[PDB]
Scaffold this active site. Structure first.
Site, PDB file in Angstrom:
ATOM      1  N   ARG A  55       0.852  -1.155   0.000  1.00 54.91           N
ATOM      2  CA  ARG A  55       0.000   0.000   0.000  1.00 54.91           C
ATOM      3  C   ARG A  55       0.899   1.220   0.000  1.00 54.91           C
ATOM      4  O   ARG A  55       1.643   1.426   0.960  1.00 54.91           O
ATOM      5  CB  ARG A  55      -0.914  -0.124   1.245  1.00 54.91           C
ATOM      6  CG  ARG A  55      -1.853   1.029   1.563  1.00 54.91           C
ATOM      7  CD  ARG A  55      -2.809   0.589   2.700  1.00 54.91           C
ATOM      8  NE  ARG A  55      -3.688   1.683   3.032  1.00 54.91           N
ATOM      9  CZ  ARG A  55      -3.443   2.561   3.997  1.00 54.91           C
ATOM     10  NH1 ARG A  55      -2.369   2.498   4.765  1.00 54.91           N
ATOM     11  NH2 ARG A  55      -4.286   3.579   4.174  1.00 54.91           N
ATOM     12  N   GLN A  63       3.739   1.434   2.876  1.00 56.89           N
ATOM     13  CA  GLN A  63       3.510   0.391   3.874  1.00 56.89           C
ATOM     14  C   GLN A  63       3.904  -0.990   3.386  1.00 56.89           C
ATOM     15  O   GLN A  63       3.585  -1.426   2.270  1.00 56.89           O
ATOM     16  CB  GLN A  63       2.013   0.415   4.265  1.00 56.89           C
ATOM     17  CG  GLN A  63       1.587  -0.508   5.433  1.00 56.89           C
ATOM     18  CD  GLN A  63       0.080  -0.566   5.633  1.00 56.89           C
ATOM     19  OE1 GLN A  63      -0.652   0.230   5.069  1.00 56.89           O
ATOM     20  NE2 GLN A  63      -0.474  -1.492   6.411  1.00 56.89           N
ATOM     21  N   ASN A 102      -0.603  -0.979  12.840  1.00 50.59           N
ATOM     22  CA  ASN A 102      -1.264  -1.883  13.801  1.00 50.59           C
ATOM     23  C   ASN A 102      -2.756  -1.960  13.499  1.00 50.59           C
ATOM     24  O   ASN A 102      -3.199  -1.324  12.515  1.00 50.59           O
ATOM     25  CB  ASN A 102      -1.075  -1.397  15.246  1.00 50.59           C
ATOM     26  CG  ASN A 102      -1.404   0.047  15.545  1.00 50.59           C
ATOM     27  OD1 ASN A 102      -0.557   0.824  16.022  1.00 50.59           O
ATOM     28  ND2 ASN A 102      -2.603   0.505  15.246  1.00 50.59           N
ATOM     29  N   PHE A 113       5.571   1.310   8.169  1.00 49.92           N
ATOM     30  CA  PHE A 113       5.478   2.256   7.105  1.00 49.92           C
ATOM     31  C   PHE A 113       6.638   3.235   7.264  1.00 49.92           C
ATOM     32  O   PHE A 113       7.180   3.481   8.368  1.00 49.92           O
ATOM     33  CB  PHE A 113       4.108   3.001   7.120  1.00 49.92           C
ATOM     34  CG  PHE A 113       3.712   3.759   8.359  1.00 49.92           C
ATOM     35  CD1 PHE A 113       3.231   3.065   9.483  1.00 49.92           C
ATOM     36  CD2 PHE A 113       3.789   5.142   8.365  1.00 49.92           C
ATOM     37  CE1 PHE A 113       2.823   3.769  10.610  1.00 49.92           C
ATOM     38  CE2 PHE A 113       3.386   5.851   9.474  1.00 49.92           C
ATOM     39  CZ  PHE A 113       2.900   5.158  10.597  1.00 49.92           C
ATOM     40  N   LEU A 122      -0.674  10.634  13.800  1.00 48.84           N
ATOM     41  CA  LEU A 122      -0.452   9.245  14.188  1.00 48.84           C
ATOM     42  C   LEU A 122       0.279   9.062  15.497  1.00 48.84           C
ATOM     43  O   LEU A 122       0.536   7.959  15.981  1.00 48.84           O
ATOM     44  CB  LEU A 122       0.307   8.564  13.056  1.00 48.84           C
ATOM     45  CG  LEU A 122      -0.413   8.459  11.692  1.00 48.84           C
ATOM     46  CD1 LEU A 122       0.474   7.808  10.664  1.00 48.84           C
ATOM     47  CD2 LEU A 122      -1.679   7.624  11.848  1.00 48.84           C
ATOM     48  N   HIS A 126       0.867   5.119  16.861  1.00 49.32           N
ATOM     49  CA  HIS A 126       1.804   4.195  16.255  1.00 49.32           C
ATOM     50  C   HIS A 126       3.180   4.416  16.853  1.00 49.32           C
ATOM     51  O   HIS A 126       3.503   5.558  17.173  1.00 49.32           O
ATOM     52  CB  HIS A 126       1.815   4.453  14.770  1.00 49.32           C
ATOM     53  CG  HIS A 126       0.487   4.120  14.126  1.00 49.32           C
ATOM     54  ND1 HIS A 126       0.161   2.942  13.645  1.00 49.32           N
ATOM     55  CD2 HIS A 126      -0.611   4.944  14.021  1.00 49.32           C
ATOM     56  CE1 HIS A 126      -1.090   2.979  13.265  1.00 49.32           C
ATOM     57  NE2 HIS A 126      -1.536   4.187  13.497  1.00 49.32           N
TER      58      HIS A 126
END
Lengths: 165, 11
Positions: A55, A63, A102, A113, A122, A126
């Site tokens: 992705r 990612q 996650n 990523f 984020l 993360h």
């Protein structure tokens, strides 16, 4: 530990693109850095070599790490199916940050990523555990094969990976 | 939106 450096040699449909190397912050998130280091060496007999970035969203991140399923549903840590969020000391400060993907609290596996932008939203969700040391221009070239929805125009794989230092 | 999840990808 004195901070390990890992490399990924990226290929696009088999044609080489180059190497990106990462400094892993094992001095702030030892458990998370160590999981990524050992999956890069493949020393537990499983890891990232041959997997793909499934992705890539231009202006956001690339990612990868799902070496089980290759699509976002798999992957596993060297500590088992999942492991806990070690800490949120480091923030998503700009391009080049490496952080854990996650599926909610304490679900870290192998997916990660590489940020190609600052992703402050984020922070605290993360775990940031490294940054690109060399090869950011290889990452900016990988962005071009992605799309708004993250589907890639070519298969981007980690053709070989290991530790440098 | 812009998230990085593993399983339920949101907007």
């Amino acid at each position: 530990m004195v901070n390990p450096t890992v490399f990924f040699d990226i290929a696009v449909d088999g044609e080489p693109l180059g190497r990106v190397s990462f400094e892993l912050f094992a001095d702030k998130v030892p458990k998370t850095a160590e999981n990524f280091r050992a999956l890069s060496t493949g020393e537990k007999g499983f890891g990232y070599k041959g997997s793909c970035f499934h992705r890539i969203i231009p202006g956001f991140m690339c990612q990868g790490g799902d070496f089980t399923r290759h699509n976002g549903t798999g992957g596993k840590s060297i500590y088992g199916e999942k492991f806990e969020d070690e800490n949120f000391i480091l923030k998503h400060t700009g391009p080049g940050i490496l952080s854990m993907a996650n599926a909610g609290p304490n679900t870290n596996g192998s997916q990660f990523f590489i940020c190609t932008a600052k992703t402050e939203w984020l922070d605290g969700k993360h775990v940031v555990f490294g940054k690109v040391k060399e090869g950011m221009n290889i990452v900016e070239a990988m962005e071009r094969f992605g799309s708004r929805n993250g589907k890639t125009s070519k298969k981007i794989t980690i053709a070989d990976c290991g530790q440098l230092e | 939106x812009l998230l990085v999840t593993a399983x339920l990808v949101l907007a």
